[PDB]
Design a protein around this ligand. Structure first.
Ligand SMILES: [Mg+2]
Ligand SMILES: [Mg+2]
Ligand SMILES: [Mg+2]
Ligand SMILES: [Mg+2]
Ligand SMILES: [Mg+2]
Ligand SMILES: [Mg+2]
Ligand SMILES: [Mg+2]
Ligand SMILES: [Mg+2]
Ligand SMILES: [Mg+2]
Lengths: 51, 183, 171, 147, 114, 48
RNA sequence: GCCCUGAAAAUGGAUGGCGCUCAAGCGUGUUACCUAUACUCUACCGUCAGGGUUGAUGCCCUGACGAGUAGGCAGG
RNA sequence: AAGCUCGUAUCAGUUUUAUGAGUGUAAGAAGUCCUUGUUUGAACGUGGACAUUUGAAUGAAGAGCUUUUAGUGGGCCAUUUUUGGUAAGCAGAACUGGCGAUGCGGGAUGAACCGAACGUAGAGUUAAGGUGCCGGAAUACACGCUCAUCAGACACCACAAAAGGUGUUAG
RNA sequence: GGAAUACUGCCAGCUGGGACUGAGGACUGCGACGUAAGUCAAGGAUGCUGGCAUAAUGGUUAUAUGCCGCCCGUCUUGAAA
C-alpha cells in the first residue's frame, strides 16, 4: 500500500539486502587500502613538466 | 585499475582505461516543438517526457542515436553508487504492462529468474557490468521518473552544450552529480 | 570558471603494419577535463589531419603551479579569430600562477576586445626571469624599489539601512 | 505532458456482453461465463463467445449438414453442438441416431431427430452432461451464402 | 550486359530528372534499346509507384543483396561445420564494441609538444 | 527527347498494349505522322 | 572596444514608469535567491486496461492516463 | 463502426552493416541443403531434412483481410536546398516545422518570439525570464570599459562612406 | 627527505532543527532483534493532555483589501481594432 525507500528505512534495506548487515559490521564503506611505494618514471616527470 | 596506472607510470608508459560500456541518459527538454527524427529516437529510447532517464549499452548503433538526440538530453557515465541509489529509490518493474515497485526480491526472481537474476543486487550487477541479459533486464526496468535537480541546473540557460556552459550533451562523469541531485 | 591547466597526450589509432603512432602533447587551460579534451581535439584537427573518431586520448594530467605563493611576471602570447585572419597579441600580467594569469587575460579580453573563450587561442605563457625584460609600463610601475601607495577615499560597507553618524572616508 | 506513442483510453471491445434482453439467454451466458472462468476449457470459451453473436452472425445449421458432419470417421458418436437454430431439411432421406444440443430446434428438425431415435437437448443440459465439452462437435452455418 | 525483368539496377548518369541520381529500383520492362525501371517514391505519407524509361548505358547492376547472399552461404557453412563438430557458434552480426584497455609505451615514441 | 537520358512514362499509356514501346520511338512515330499529314495537305492544296 | 557626428518635422509622453553615472549602463566570470496548469511524491474524481470472485451488466485488487472547433459514441 | 483470422504475429518519420549517389536499395518459411528431371551453362523442378544459438541495434500488444459513413479540401508564417533576379523589395519549385480547433509562465502590452501543453488539491524543485523601487527574489562578489548641451539598457537589417573627432583605453 | 592541507569522489557513518501528508481498517506477507518464550520503526498513526461545548469553529450574506478579469452571439485568416 505504500512504497518505502531502502536508503532511509533500515528494515527495508535489510529485507532487500542481507549483506548490508555484514557491510555495516565490517565497515567496508571506509576500507583502508594497502600502501605501495611506486615511483613515477623520470620520462613521465619530464614530459609532465615540459612546456 | 589504480595499480595498472601506477605500474605504467613507473615503467615510463601510459595506461589507457577501457572505454565505457554503459551510459545514463536523461531527457532535459519538453514535448513541444521537437523535430521528427529526434522525436522518434527519443521514443525509441523511451524518453517520452521531461526528466525521464534510461540506461543505454554503448555500441556504434546507439552512439549515433545519442548524437542525434544530443540537443535534448544530458547523458554520461554512471557510477556504482548512482546506479544503486537509482534502483533502490526509483526502481520499478514492467510486469504484464504494469509499473510495479521493486519492494521485494521475490518480484525480481519471478520475472527475471530465467536469466539467473534473483535479487535487486543481481539486477544492479547486470546493469553495471553489461551482461548477456542486459537488454532483458534494462527493458524490465521501467524508465526512471526523476525530479528537477534539488540545487538547480547550475547554469542560467540550459539549452546550450555542456562544453559551452549549457546542460545538454555528454558530460561524462558529472552525470553522477546531476542524477543524484535529480533523484 | 576557475581555470586549471592540463596536459593532454593523444595519438592516432594503431593500424595494420603501422604500430606505435606518434604521441602528441598539448597544454590546455580549461575548467574541466571534458572541455580540455574538446579543446585538444579541436586544435589537433586544426593543426594535423587527425579527427576525434580516428584518434584516441592516451593521458590527461593536471599540472599544478611549481611555486604558487611567489609573485611572478608573465608574458602571454595569444591570437584571436578575426575576419582578416589570426592577429597576434602580447600581454604582461603580474600574478602568482599561470592559471590566474590566464583567467585575468580572459577577463581582460572580454572587457576590452569583447572576445570569447572559443575565439581566444592561448599560444604561450612564459615567466619573465629578469625584471629588465618587462616592457609594459603598467607592470613596470609596480617594480619600483620600496613601492608604497595609499588608498584614499575608503568606502565602508554598511549592514544597516540607517546610520546615526556622518561617515568618514579616512584611511 | 508526455509524448504518447499509443492511443489513450482505447477500448478493446471483443463483444463483452450480449445485446439481447432474453432472461434465459442471460442465464445461459452466466452459466457458461462461470464454466469458462473455472474450467480453462477452450470449448467453454468458444461457446461463451458464440453466445454473444448477433442473428446475422449466427446462421442456421441444417440437419443434412449435421449428418454430413457425423459421417466423418471417428465422429459417429459425438454430440453435435450448434449455438443457434437447427433447421429441418427435406432433401435428405436417411438420418442417423445422434444427440444434438442447440439453442433452438424447429418443429421439423426436432421431429426428424426424434424419429431417427436421438434426442434434442439444450445448452445447460449439455453443460451438465459434458462440463468440459468432451466428445463435442461444434457446427457453424454458412456465412457468405447470404446477401 | 544483359538485363532481365526482376533485376535490381542503379540509375547513374554518365539535365532533366536530376532527382533520379543514385536511385535504386527494380526492372519491369526490357526492350532492344530501352529499359523500364520501377521506382517507389515518397509522396506525402505514402509510397507511389512510378515507371521510368532509361537507356542501356545509364543503368548498371546493383550489389545490394550481394552481402546478404554471401552471409547466408557463410552462415550455412558455419552451421554445418558446428553441427559436424559439436561446439557453440555465433551467427548473428554485432555492432562495433568499445575498445578495451591498453598500455602505450614511450620507447622511442616520446610525446612531442605542439 | 530522343537523346534524353530518362523519360517518365505517362499514366494514360497504362492499360494499353503500347506501354512496352519506347516513348522516344512513339514520339518519333507521331512526328513522322504529322510530317506526312502536312505533306498530304500540301498535295491536296496542289490538287485543288 | 567604448563615446560624439553620422538628419530631424509638426497636440504633451515615454529603456513599461520612477529613476540610475567606481550604475540600477556595456563585456565576462562565480554563487545565492524568486516562481508555470512543467517535473517528483501523496490523496481524491473519472476513463481505459489487466487479474480474482458460486446489489454477477455487481463486489475486490492492480497499473496507466485526463487539451480540443466541426463531428462521433455513451450515460444522465 | 462491424465482422474473420494471426498474435516472437505484424511492424518502425531511428540507428548499424553491405552496396550506389554525390540521400536510394537490401538484411531469410514469399528460406537453405542433398538428389539431376525441364526447355556442358543461366532460369524452372522430383523426394527427403535441419528450429526455440532462424539469422544487426533499439523499441513496440496489438496487427492483417473484407464490408461499412460524419466533417472537410486552395490559408498564413518560418527554416533548409536549387533556379532566375530587382533601385530595392523578391519571383517560381521540393521537403519539413508552427497556427486556425489551445488554455498556462515569460518577453510591459501582441496571430505566428522564448518555455511549456491543461482533471480537482497539498508539499517540494525548476524551465524561460529575472532579483534598486513599482515587484516575489543579492543596492551580491570579482575583473575591466564608458560621461553623451536629451548616453545606454534593441530588434544584430538600414541610415553606415569600417566616413569624420586634438575623447579615452588596449594592441 | 618527511609530513600536512586543498580539490574531487565514496560510506548498507552518526546526529540537530523546519514544513506538508496519516490514504488503508480482524489475521495472512517479506524481514529484523533475540538460546528462548516474545518484541519490533517490518504489507499507510498512534499515545497523553487542555480549553470550549457555542455563534467559538464553520456556512450564508453586505462590504473592504491584495492580485487577476475587454461585451456577448454571429461572420470573416484575423479581430480591442
Ligand atoms: Mg533552494
Ligand atoms: Mg534560467
Ligand atoms: Mg530591473
Ligand atoms: Mg554585469
Ligand atoms: Mg496529464
Ligand atoms: Mg522585493
Ligand atoms: Mg533617416
Ligand atoms: Mg469564519
Ligand atoms: Mg487587468
Amino acid at each position: 500500500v505504500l512504497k518505502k525507500n531502502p536508503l532511509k528505512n533500515k528494515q527495508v534495506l535489510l529485507r532487500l539486502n542481507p549483506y548490508a548487515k555484514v557491510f555495516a559490521a565490517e565497515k567496508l564503506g571506509s576500507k583502508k587500502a594497502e600502501k605501495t611505494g611506486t615511483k613515477p618514471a623520470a620520462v613521465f616527470t619530464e614530459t609532465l613538466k615540459h612546456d | 585499475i589504480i595499480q595498472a596506472k601506477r605500474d605504467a607510470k613507473a615503467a615510463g608508459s601510459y595506461y589507457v582505461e577501457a572505454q565505457h560500456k554503459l551510459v545514463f541518459v536523461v531527457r532535459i527538454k519538453g514535448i513541444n516543438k521537437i523535430p521528427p527524427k529526434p522525436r522518434k529516437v527519443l521514443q525509441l529510447l523511451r524518453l517520452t517526457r521531461i526528466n525521464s532517464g534510461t540506461f543505454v549499452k554503448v555500441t556504434k548503433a546507439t552512439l549515433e542515436l545519442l548524437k542525434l538526440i544530443e540537443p535534448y538530453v544530458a547523458y554520461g557515465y554512471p557510477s556504482y553508487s548512482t546506479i544503486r541509489q537509482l534502483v533502490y529509490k526509483r526502481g520499478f518493474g514492467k510486469i504484464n504492462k504494469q509499473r510495479v515497485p521493486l519492494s521485494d526480491n521475490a518480484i525480481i526472481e519471478a520475472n527475471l529468474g530465467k536469466y539467473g537474476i534473483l535479487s535487486i543486487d543481481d539486477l544492479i550487477h547486470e546493469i553495471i557490468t553489461v551482461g548477456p541479459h542486459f537488454k532483458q533486464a534494462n527493458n524490465f526496468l521501467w524508465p526512471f521518473k526523476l525530479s528537477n535537480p534539488s540545487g538547480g541546473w547550475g547554469v542560467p540557460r540550459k539549452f546550450k552544450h555542456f562544453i559551452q556552459g549549457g546542460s545538454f550533451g555528454n558530460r561524462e562523469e558529472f552525470i553522477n552529480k546531476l542524477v543524484k541531485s535529480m533523484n | 570558471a576557475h581555470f586549471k591547466e592540463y596536459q593532454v597526450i593523444g595519438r592516432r589509432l594503431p593500424t595494420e603494419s603501422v604500430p606505435e603512432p606518434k604521441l602528441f602533447r598539448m597544454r590546455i587551460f580549461a575548467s574541466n577535463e571534458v572541455i580540455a579534451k574538446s579543446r585538444y581535439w579541436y586544435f589537433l584537427q586544426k593543426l594535423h589531419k587527425v579527427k576525434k573518431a580516428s584518434g584516441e586520448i592516451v593521458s590527461i594530467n593536471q599540472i599544478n603551479e611549481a611555486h604558487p605563493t611567489k609573485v611572478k611576471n608573465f608574458g602571454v602570447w595569444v591570437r584571436y579569430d578575426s575576419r582578416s585572419g589570426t592577429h597576434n597579441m602580447y600581454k604582461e600580467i603580474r600574478d602568482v600562477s599561470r592559471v590566474a594569469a590566464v583567467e585575468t587575460l580572459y577577463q581582460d579580453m572580454a572587457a576590452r576586445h569583447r572576445a570569447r573563450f572559443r575565439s581566444i587561442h592561448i599560444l604561450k605563457v612564459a615567466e619573465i626571469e629578469k625584471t629588465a625584460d618587462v616592457k609594459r609600463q603598467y607592470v613596470k610601475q609596480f617594480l619600483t624599489k620600496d613601492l608604497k601607495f595609499p588608498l584614499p577615499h575608503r568606502v565602508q560597507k554598511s549592514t544597516k539601512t540607517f546610520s546615526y553618524k556622518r561617515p568618514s572616508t579616512f584611511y | 505532458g508526455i509524448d504518447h506513442t499509443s492511443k489513450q483510453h482505447k477500448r478493446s471491445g471483443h463483444r463483452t456482453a450480449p445485446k439481447s434482453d432474453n432472461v434465459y439467454l442471460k442465464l445461459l451466458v452466466k452459466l457458461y461465463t462461470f464454466l469458462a472462468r473455472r474450467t480453462d476449457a477452450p470449448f467453454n470459451k468458444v461457446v461463451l463467445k458464440a453466445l454473444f453473436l448477433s442473428k446475422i452472425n449466427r446462421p442456421p445449421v441444417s440437419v443434412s449438414r449435421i449428418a454430413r458432419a457425423l459421417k466423418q470417421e471417428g465422429a459417429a458418436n459425438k454430440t453435435v453442438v450448434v449455438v443457434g437454430t437447427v433447421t429441418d431439411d427435406a432433401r435428405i432421406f436417411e438420418f442417423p441416431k445422434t444427440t444434438v444440443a442447440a439453442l433452438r430446434f424447429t418443429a421439423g428438425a426436432r421431429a426428424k431427430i426424434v424419429k431417427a431415435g436421438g434426442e434434442c437437448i439444450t445448452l445447460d443440459q449439455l453443460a451438465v452432461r459434458a462440463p468440459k465439452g468432451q466428445n463435442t462437435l461444434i457446427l457453424r452455418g454458412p456465412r457468405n451464402s447470404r446477401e | 550486359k544483359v538485363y532481365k525483368v526482376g533485376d535490381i539496377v542503379d540509375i547513374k548518369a554518365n539535365m532533366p530528372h536530376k532527382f533520379y541520381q543514385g536511385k535504386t529500383g527494380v526492372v519491369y520492362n526490357v526492350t532492344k534499346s530501352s529499359v523500364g525501371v520501377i521506382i517507389n517514391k515518397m509522396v506525402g505519407n505514402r509510397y507511389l509507384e512510378k515507371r521510368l524509361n532509361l537507356r542501356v548505358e545509364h543503368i548498371k547492376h546493383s550489389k545490394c543483396r550481394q552481402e546478404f547472399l554471401e552471409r547466408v552461404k557463410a552462415n550455412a557453412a558455419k552451421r554445418a561445420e558446428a553441427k559436424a563438430q559439436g561446439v557453440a557458434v555465433q551467427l548473428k552480426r554485432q555492432p562495433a564494441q568499445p575498445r578495451e584497455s591498453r598500455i602505450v609505451s614511450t620507447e622511442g615514441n616520446v610525446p612531442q609538444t605542439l | 527527347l530522343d537523346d534524353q537520358w530518362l523519360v517518365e512514362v505517362d499514366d494514360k499509356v497504362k492499360g494499353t498494349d503500347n506501354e512496352l514501346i519506347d516513348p522516344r520511338t512513339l514520339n518519333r512515330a507521331e512526328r513522322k505522322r504529322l510530317v506526312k499529314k502536312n505533306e498530304k495537305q500540301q498535295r491536296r492544296n496542289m490538287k485543288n
